[PDB]
Amino acid sequence: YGPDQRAQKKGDIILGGLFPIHFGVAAKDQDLKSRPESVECIRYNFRGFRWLQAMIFAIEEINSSPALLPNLTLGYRIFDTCNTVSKALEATLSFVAQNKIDSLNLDEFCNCSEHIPSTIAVVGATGSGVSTAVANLLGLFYIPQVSYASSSRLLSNKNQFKSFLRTIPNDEHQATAMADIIEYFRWNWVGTIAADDDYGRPGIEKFREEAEERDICIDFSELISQYSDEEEIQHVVEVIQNSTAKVIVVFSSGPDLEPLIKEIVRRNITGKIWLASEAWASSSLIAMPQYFHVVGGTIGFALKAGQIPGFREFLKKVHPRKSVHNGFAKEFWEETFNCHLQEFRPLCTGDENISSVETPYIDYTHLRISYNVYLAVYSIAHALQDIYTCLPGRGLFTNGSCADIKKVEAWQVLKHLRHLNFTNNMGEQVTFDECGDLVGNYSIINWHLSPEDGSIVFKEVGYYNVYAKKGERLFINEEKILWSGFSREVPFSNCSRDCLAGTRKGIIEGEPTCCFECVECPDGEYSDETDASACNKCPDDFWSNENHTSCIAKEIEFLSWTEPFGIALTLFAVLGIFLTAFVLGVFIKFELSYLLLFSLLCCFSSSLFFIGEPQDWTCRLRQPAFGISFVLCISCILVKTNRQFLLVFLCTFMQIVICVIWLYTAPPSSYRNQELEDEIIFITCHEGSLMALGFLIGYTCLLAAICFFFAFKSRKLPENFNEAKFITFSMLIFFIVWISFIPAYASTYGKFVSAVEVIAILAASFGLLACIFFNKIYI
Amino acid sequence: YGPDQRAQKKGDIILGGLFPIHFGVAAKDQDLKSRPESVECIRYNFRGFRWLQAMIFAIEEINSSPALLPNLTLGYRIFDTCNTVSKALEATLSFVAQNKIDSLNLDEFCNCSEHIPSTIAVVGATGSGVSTAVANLLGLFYIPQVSYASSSRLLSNKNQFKSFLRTIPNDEHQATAMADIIEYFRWNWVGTIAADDDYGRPGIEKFREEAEERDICIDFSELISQYSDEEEIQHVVEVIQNSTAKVIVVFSSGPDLEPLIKEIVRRNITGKIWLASEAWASSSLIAMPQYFHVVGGTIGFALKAGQIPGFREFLKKVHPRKSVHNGFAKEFWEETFNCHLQEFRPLCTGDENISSVETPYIDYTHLRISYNVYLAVYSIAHALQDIYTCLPGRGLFTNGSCADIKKVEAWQVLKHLRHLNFTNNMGEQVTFDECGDLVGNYSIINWHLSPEDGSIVFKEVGYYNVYAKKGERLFINEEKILWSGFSREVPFSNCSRDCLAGTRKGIIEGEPTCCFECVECPDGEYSDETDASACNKCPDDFWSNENHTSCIAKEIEFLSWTEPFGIALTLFAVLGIFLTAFVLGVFIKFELSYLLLFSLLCCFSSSLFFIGEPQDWTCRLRQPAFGISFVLCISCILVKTNRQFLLVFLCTFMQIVICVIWLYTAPPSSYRNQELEDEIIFITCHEGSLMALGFLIGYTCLLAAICFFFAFKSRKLPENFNEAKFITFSMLIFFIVWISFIPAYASTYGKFVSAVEVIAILAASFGLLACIFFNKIYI
Ligand SMILES: *[C@@H]1O[C@H](CO)[C@@H](O[C@@H]2O[C@H](CO)[C@@H](O[C@@H]3O[C@H](CO)[C@@H](O)[C@H](O)[C@H]3NC(C)=O)[C@H](O)[C@H]2NC(C)=O)[C@H](O)[C@H]1NC(C)=O
Ligand SMILES: *[C@@H]1O[C@H](CO)[C@@H](O[C@@H]2O[C@H](CO)[C@@H](O[C@@H]3O[C@H](CO)[C@@H](O)[C@H](O)[C@H]3NC(C)=O)[C@H](O)[C@H]2NC(C)=O)[C@H](O)[C@H]1NC(C)=O
Ligand SMILES: *[C@@H]1O[C@H](CO)[C@@H](O[C@@H]2O[C@H](CO)[C@@H](O)[C@H](O)[C@H]2NC(C)=O)[C@H](O)[C@H]1NC(C)=O
Ligand SMILES: *[C@@H]1O[C@H](CO)[C@@H](O[C@@H]2O[C@H](CO)[C@@H](O)[C@H](O)[C@H]2NC(C)=O)[C@H](O)[C@H]1NC(C)=O
Ligand SMILES: *[C@@H]1O[C@H](CO)[C@@H](O)[C@H](O)[C@H]1NC(C)=O
Ligand SMILES: *[C@@H]1O[C@H](CO)[C@@H](O)[C@H](O)[C@H]1NC(C)=O
Ligand SMILES: *[C@@H]1O[C@H](CO)[C@@H](O)[C@H](O)[C@H]1NC(C)=O
Ligand SMILES: *[C@@H]1O[C@H](CO)[C@@H](O)[C@H](O)[C@H]1NC(C)=O
Ligand SMILES: *[C@@H]1O[C@H](CO)[C@@H](O)[C@H](O)[C@H]1NC(C)=O
Ligand SMILES: *[C@@H]1O[C@H](CO)[C@@H](O)[C@H](O)[C@H]1NC(C)=O
Ligand SMILES: *[C@@H]1O[C@H](CO)[C@@H](O)[C@H](O)[C@H]1NC(C)=O
Ligand SMILES: *[C@@H]1O[C@H](CO)[C@@H](O)[C@H](O)[C@H]1NC(C)=O
Ligand SMILES: [Ca+2]
Ligand SMILES: [Ca+2]
Ligand SMILES: [Ca+2]
Ligand SMILES: [Ca+2]
């Protein structure tokens, strides 16, 4: 009853089932001026009719085989939901009629002797919003509903849907797989579009939750339908164009993506690559070659293919007249042949060949959902069989007491369906869990343009083994994948391009983390990693490179030990010591010849003890550069004509005591400074307050000025071959050297602050020897 | 029929309605050993019973008033959903019994003469998952459903729910308001918890979508229920503790938050402040004083209060025996008095006062949902009235032909309900939109502990005017708000604390943007803003401060024009020029007295033309510092005893020609360098390759060495009061000055590179005058 397009056949036990023979209802709206009448469905679904044939086929095979349910035939009242909740509820109200005794005891019947014998288990409602509406109704009467293609996670909530089983995997696996795919191809900037019903809406929440643990931040999320208006589709495609994310994850059904794909190919937005949900990844409404400019190379999902024998030929035996138990065969025939059956459109002969025309009823490669229909009706049969072969004292009910077959109630069938364990034709075990659902392995496909009048061929490119460990479930042989239909390289789909190791990562205010900016980091970068969030700081021994990479450029080594700018001065000091030694040999062969020889050799020989890399000892050894000059300058008070003569310890020991007092004041320690940036490693010996200044002013600025005060009366006086004038010239030369020393010493640094001191000491020690020894020898 | 707990009363036209008298069903599960029987509901809902009384009250008021629907009474079969889809569907299958003629024509009736006269409009199903299940069923028969409290956005989809109206606002406004609240108090780190049904699940998607335009990034999102297990509640509160976000947005119903609040107060997680959805913001299951340690100061939402007169006393007239048309009064009485009515628990007298005991049936302040029930049944009445007062040729149906009253069908009532326009007792217009829903203004509340044996008082702290402009809808008088029950300052709820203007903002890899890190930025920060994402670069005139704030510290001004380190040298140059001028006056009073006076005055007077801030002219004027010395050094070849004498242009004009050739080689331009970092603004005049070196070696290193070659025979020769020896001493002094000049010039910079040149020039010009003029005068 109810609708007048059934597929009815009697039996001892009647199943019943629901199928999408059409695609939706007529788009006309009731203004409710007249009495509102039944809406007509509009498009036609050959794949849905094939699914109906798959249910019918297994019913006939069970009824023919005596090895399963003998002496007992099965019936079916298959209705047709035109993919809508209203058309589904119209049918499943006629399912529960003889069951309407419990609450409404006012049934009275008065309509049939068998009173429309009760259905025992419905099969289906492919739509997930359809099954949610039907299972609310069939949970009052505990009739088991075995869906074949409704696959949302809301239906696995057994406090509300108390009688619901399904032979399709849940969608907590598929939304994980579409996160693992993006994690495998390494994108981080995607977009989501879901159908606004119970298939896409809770299926995209799982994807949003499971693509934030992998930090794939999502650009946009928009909801579509199949009854949306042009402003909504406009808003959606403006969001699509207005963003830059090439990977779009569409979690939607077949005919709900149709108004979006129509509009996008009408506006020619080429470039986006679509991940596909399981519903429309193999869909004859989107797999059209005129759409291939935009939809191409879409990575999809499909369930594991099944094998049904003889079903291919059972499909061929269809006829509008020969099928008495099939109300849909006629409208199928006149749809596939554009006829008009009699009992614009030509009248139909009724002898046509179905394999002539091309239609998705028979043009197919793999049984996927038809296998699930087949498995569902076999599972109902095997639960009935395990009711049929139960012995007393062994059953599943109270006190082990099982029940009969001829008076069987639906809750018993549900009880035996919960504890099911049986084997396929493909030899696999089939069990429903505590939430009543199979688990299977998806087979990832890819849409290819078959270039010999073929519309679109689906090339299998991998799988997704849900049985394996987490982290390793996804195997993609990615040699076959033609991104956007033709290409071979993986398209870029990040938000910002990952820039190099010269820079760190800086951000934009109010934007997701998957796109950034990158700015170079200065003065000690050592930015070693490729996508560092903050480049490090260089260690104190090194300085950053030109291109700011890892700092192996180290600091300075300013010592000047064997440098060619100091080796010549070392040679000059050696020649000065040797010129002192030859004069010593002449003055030995042929106290003023002893002390003013030895100390004058010492002040010229120990001057080379301050060139190179300093330390504690070589930094404390700069006070003998005053002490040896103090002893060598005793000639100016010892060799005068107005000369007891060994009393030079009146001032030399005073200088030694001042140096001993300054050894605590100024340090015996070389100190580094960092005055430049890159090569600024120095050593400068850090004279404390005034120690060297006081020593110099107490010895060398005093001895020459005292000798000038005594030889101011001797410079205009010849004595001992003009030794007075020669000593006055030597004192003036030493005063000139110490006048040249001071500001050039005070204004320079590092390598060039020891070189001036050693040059001044060599100048004094060479001058005091040359103005004395040559005049004393050659005369 | 159906259930045996009705509230039934006859009438010409019967309404029917659904109400949550209990809170849920018994937690026992069917193992399905026996035949499964009807589940019993468990808790009791006094507020739900008050809502039922509010429906009954307005039905009696309409039936008493002759000014609305005269000569026509109204009936009602009010059932009770125990807040479940199954208990609702049991009732609304008994609603549609006489309507079951269209599809199932096998009704036959055979049960009643009037055949259970048809309901015309149901009222309610407060649960949004309950109304979604009922409205799928009542859209086949086009019965108008007027919900009073189901308020999700899925129900406003008129392709599927073709007959559904509601007198409660949608929840696209409330989820916007809870984003505007957080935007007003300026947090950016919140957490969301929603009930896993159709009230919280699509209501939190609107909040997630509308709190990313304001960049309030969400920490966690977890779904709860009321039939969840202890592992799930454990997982949720571990997520709550394990995070640091004090603002938690709970979008859930009354009894679904109960298992979470029980567990949280059992684990004493104090500190989180709860934003409240409209459902549980005024709920007698969560507003309990023992829970106040955790739930306190929760900002809530409530609908606009209504005013019903006499309803307070109509509630008082209740009795289990006097109410013949109310099956719930008995179980209400024995629940509110712990009696046991007869026809552990004491037997009940049946004379008790209801206002004695405290219960949410009568302990209330504002009618909120009861007003919506009242408005719903008045709206049904007024649509019936506008059917009743229609004239022919005027109606809303086809050809203007309206229909009668005595044979009225439900779709006509739906047609008149769509075009409704009527006025309240509070004088406001009530219209349903094209999606069939009122719009109202929420009144934001806050939970306060009434400290005189009061449980929890709800203090109104503002509103949310949805009629106003976007951006300005939310008014919170925030002087009343006690955060966490007692405090007064707004609690901090950001992810990272907003740090200061010394630093920029750096990020952590794999974390949301609402928390960051902040690192100081070096060497030209000028980080002026308070939360800059990247501090700027300082301009070329300035350098960054110590605390890296806005760089008003500028660069150097190294010129030394009127400095006290150059003013003394300016005084020395003026005294040198005056000492030249007095010798000029003496040599005038009492060519070697003309040229060697004027050029020797010029080389000492023009030396002050190179101290200060240089320019093009003052940078080109350093070649006369060679030219004037070249003319003043002609005395060494003009005043000799072996002296035609005006042939000084043999070398002075050669020097002038070399200077003219060098005026193109070396620039007449002062050049800046930046050798230090902070104060490094210099000007150094950038001598080109060798121009000044060639000029110096061609004039001053040549004239003295040529004069020494001629006076080597004259230094041991007195002539003209020893002028030869005096000129030899002057030439030696000039050679000493030029020997002191060179490396101290080559090794210094900036301010201290002009000071050495001007000192050397003053030393030469003072020496050549002092060794000549005094000896020529005093003799
Ligand atoms: C879009 O942005 C993605 C950031 O999420 C980039 O993903 C990065 O890819 C790198 C490889 O290309 C990964 O490097 C790997 O790091 C692990 C350490 O965990 C190493 O063992 C691997 O050897 C190393 N791979 C290689 C080839 O060296 C990054 O870890 C990964 N980033 C993250 C956060 O996981 C995408 O590369 C980028 N896409 C494009 C096209 O630039
Ligand atoms: C948590 O983080 C929030 C960031 O989202 C901070 O919000 C910031 O608050 C500031 C005021 O406290 C805002 O400054 C305002 O900026 C506007 C310019 O658009 C000016 O007109 C206002 O005068 C100015 N307000 C003041 C008082 O100067 C920031 O704009 C705002 N940030 C954003 C992105 O909107 C919260 O302050 C922070 N919470 C705590 C406790 O630190
Ligand atoms: C699940 O997917 C896996 C992977 O494709 C399939 O496991 C394979 O099974 C065959 C037969 O046992 C083995 O030869 C292969 O080695 C397996 N692959 C592995 C272990 O990686 C499996 O058939 C799929 N289906 C089911 C129901 O498990
Ligand atoms: C909506 O909220 C607004 C704000 O509280 C209410 O508007 C006020 O209405 C009264 C009466 O007309 C005026 O005196 C106030 O000035 C209004 N407030 C404004 C304009 O900010 C209004 O009553 C609420 N309800 C409805 C149905 O609009
Ligand atoms: C797309 O970008 C343009 C450019 O500003 C803007 O005007 C338009 O509103 C955007 N559309 C959407 C849907 O954001
Ligand atoms: C769309 O673009 C593709 C390539 O840019 C081009 O081949 C095709 O003709 C375009 N179609 C339309 C309708 O613009
Ligand atoms: C035993 O079985 C009978 C009927 O099968 C049942 O009524 C009884 O309750 C059972 N007793 C037990 C203990 O299981
Ligand atoms: C029952 O199912 C389990 C796993 O689901 C399987 O191991 C076992 O073999 C099954 N029983 C039979 C008899 O096949
Ligand atoms: C909470 O944090 C602890 C500390 O690492 C961790 O062991 C635990 O798993 C966390 N719990 C959750 C729910 O993340
Ligand atoms: C919870 O904590 C509050 C304050 O820290 C304290 O007053 C209260 O006694 C605690 N309760 C329990 C059960 O620990
Ligand atoms: C006029 O009204 C009659 C009955 O009310 C109806 O049958 C007819 O179709 C109407 N015609 C028009 C043009 O509205
Ligand atoms: C009908 O409703 C509109 C707004 O909804 C209002 O302006 C008008 O006054 C109403 N009509 C009557 C008669 O009140
Ligand atoms: Ca399809
Ligand atoms: Ca933003
Ligand atoms: Ca409540
Ligand atoms: Ca992360």
Numbering used by the authors:
A (entry chain B), B (entry chain A): 20 to 362, 391 to 637, 649 to 701, 724 to 859
Paper excerpt:
Calcium-sensing receptor (CaSR) is a class C G protein-coupled receptor (GPCR) that regulates Ca2+ homeostasis by monitoring extracellular levels of Ca2+ ions. CaSR is a homodimer, and each subunit possesses a bi-lobed Venus flytrap (VFT) domain-containing orthosteric binding sites for native ligands and a cysteine-rich domain (CRD) linking the VFT domain to the seven-helix transmembrane domain (TMD). CaSR responds to a diverse array of stimuli, such as cations, amino acids, polyamines, and polypeptides. Taken together, our findings demonstrate that amino acids and calcium ions act jointly to fully activate CaSR.
To address this issue, we purified full-length CaSR in a buffer supplemented with 20 mM Ca2+ and applied the sample for cryo-EM. After extensive 3D classification, three different 3D models were obtained, with resolutions of 3.8 Å, 5.6 Å, and 7.3 Å, respectively. The 3.8 Å map showed clear extra densities in both VFT domains. The densities were located in the clefts between LB1 and LB2, overlapping with the location of L-Trp in the CaSRAcc structure. We then built the structure model for the 3.8 Å map (designated as CaSRCa). Structural comparison demonstrated that the structure of CaSRCa is almost identical to that of CaSRAcc, representing the fully active state of CaSR. One reasonable explanation for this observation is that the ambient amino acid (or amino acid derivative) and supplemented Ca2+ jointly activate the CaSR receptor. In sharp contrast to CaSRCa, the 5.6 Å and 7.3 Å maps show inactive conformations of CaSR, with the CRDs and TMDs separated.
